[PDB]
Design a protein around this ligand. Structure first.
Ligand SMILES: [Zn+2]
Lengths: 187, 171, 48, 39
């Protein structure tokens, strides 16, 4: 268990994940194998909230879960749960959360272009340059929706796009540091 | 029943003494005289002394005379901070704010003096749990970033599809 | 469900919400499901 | 059990999205074997 793997896990979990979950990952770090009931006792949190967090953790398979059955002295049926962190699973899961973050930004950028520029207040809906041109009549001499009978301005569309472009640059700066840590891990 | 509520009354009297502020430990017989426990049998008192007084964590024994432990409860905000740090190091967990309040006068002012170093979490019973902050590592998370995080779900992603995505992206 | 996912609501909340969504969709497709409750119209008359 | 799926080998709930992704991973040629026209 080289210290580099532990450093990667600590840095990623502490910088780019939730504090309440990091609290449980601390127990996972402290001991490789822990009872689920012992994890509860260490966590000191309500069963319902813990089970919600555990369902999220099960979905993301951050920590692998196994089921063990043994016979108690009393003989009553007992169900025993074991959760333990796996570095190989964790690295990939984290890496892809990182990766799909970018696909989302690209999709938002493309949607911005997808939206139509023409928009008409009386109509109250977006309009394709196509529809605007057909609505235009050569005899009248001006291009204007046939239905609403008011001029169309495209300036309103420009504003939100500019705002989003600024946000993307900030995201790149905030995500810069973690890539070096990832590189140290691949080392 | 017999010989249980009397012990409870003694322990409550000790809390009343501590609201009084008399740090000096007191004799059990004198406590009985103050609490009108003379009527009770002596043997029950002896059993209490031998077993229950030692079992009670709040109670302490000094020079053959029994009284609370002035060390157990918090007395100064600096010691509260140090205790929180030690609890974080040893994985003890936070301490109940009601107990800290009855322990320390003006505990709320103590917390205000802590400020950022102390993290308080609400509880359905209104009890406040306190956790020391980590000085070594400090990180900032922005709400938009947390949202961009939140949407994406690996649970949708199937494990084989995971290793496949890495292999596809040529690394 | 969209708002719950947006807020990162409890996993059990989302699970029960998805269960109810599945129930509603399956009931709309067919209201005569085997061994499942019938969706009334707030008046005791099962929906068609 | 009613309108929900359980996969037991231990035993976990099978959400619709898992089956959706598995079916997407399935190839067109396998559809002919399964007797379902892919197009
Ligand atoms: Zn118009």
């Amino acid at each position: 268990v080289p210290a580099a793997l532990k450093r990667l896990a600590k840095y990623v979990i502490r910088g780019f994940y939730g504090i309440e979950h990091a609290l449980a990952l601390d127990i996972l770090i402290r001991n490789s194998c822990v009872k689920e009931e012992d994890m509860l006792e260490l966590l000191k949190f309500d069963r319902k909230q813990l089970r919600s967090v555990l369902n999220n953790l099960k979905g993301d398979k951050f920590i692998k879960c196994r089921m063990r059955v043994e016979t108690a002295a009393d003989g009553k049926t007992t169900r025993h749960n074991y959760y333990f962190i796996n570095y190989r699973t964790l690295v990939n899961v984290v890496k892809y959360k990182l990766d799909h973050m970018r696909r989302r930004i690209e999709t938002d950028e493309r949607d911005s272009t997808n939206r139509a520029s023409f928009k008409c207040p009386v109509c109250s809906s977006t309009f394709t340059d196509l529809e605007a041109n057909q609505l235009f009549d050569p005899m009248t001499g001006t291009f204007r929706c046939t239905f609403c009978h008011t001029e169309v301005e495209e300036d309103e569309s420009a504003m939100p796009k500019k705002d989003a472009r600024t946000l993307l640059a900030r995201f790149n700066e905030q995500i810069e540091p973690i890539y070096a840590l990832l590189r140290e891990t691949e080392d | 029943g017999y010989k249980f509520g009397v012990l409870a009354k003694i322990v409550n009297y000790m809390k009343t003494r501590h609201q009084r502020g008399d740090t000096h430990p007191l004799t059990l017989d004198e406590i009985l005289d103050e609490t009108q426990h003379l009527d009770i049998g002596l043997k029950q008192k002896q059993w209490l002394m031998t077993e229950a007084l030692v079992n009670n964590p709040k109670i302490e024994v000094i020079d053959g005379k029994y009284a609370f432990k002035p060390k157990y409860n918090v007395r100064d905000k600096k010691a509260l901070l140090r205790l929180l740090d030690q609890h974080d190091q040893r994985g003890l967990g936070g301490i109940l704010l009601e107990d800290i309040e009855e322990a320390l006068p003006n505990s709320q002012k103590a917390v205000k003096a802590l400020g950022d170093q102390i993290l308080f979490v609400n509880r359905p019973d209104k009890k406040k749990i306190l956790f020391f902050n980590d000085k070594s590592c400090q990180f900032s998370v922005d709400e938009e970033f947390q949202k961009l995080w939140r949407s994406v779900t690996v649970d949708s992603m199937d494990e084989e599809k995971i290793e496949e995505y890495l292999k596809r992206q040529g690394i | 469900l969209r708002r719950n996912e947006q807020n990162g609501a409890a996993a059990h909340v989302i699970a029960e919400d998805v269960k109810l969504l599945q129930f509603h969709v399956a009931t709309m497709v067919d209201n005569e499901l085997p061994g499942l409750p019938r969706a009334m119209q707030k008046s005791g008359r099962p929906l068609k | 059990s009613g309108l929900e799926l359980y996969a037991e080998w231990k035993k976990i709930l099978l959400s619709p999205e898992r089956v959706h992704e598995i079916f997407k991973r399935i190839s067109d040629e396998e559809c002919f074997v399964l007797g379902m026209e892919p197009r």
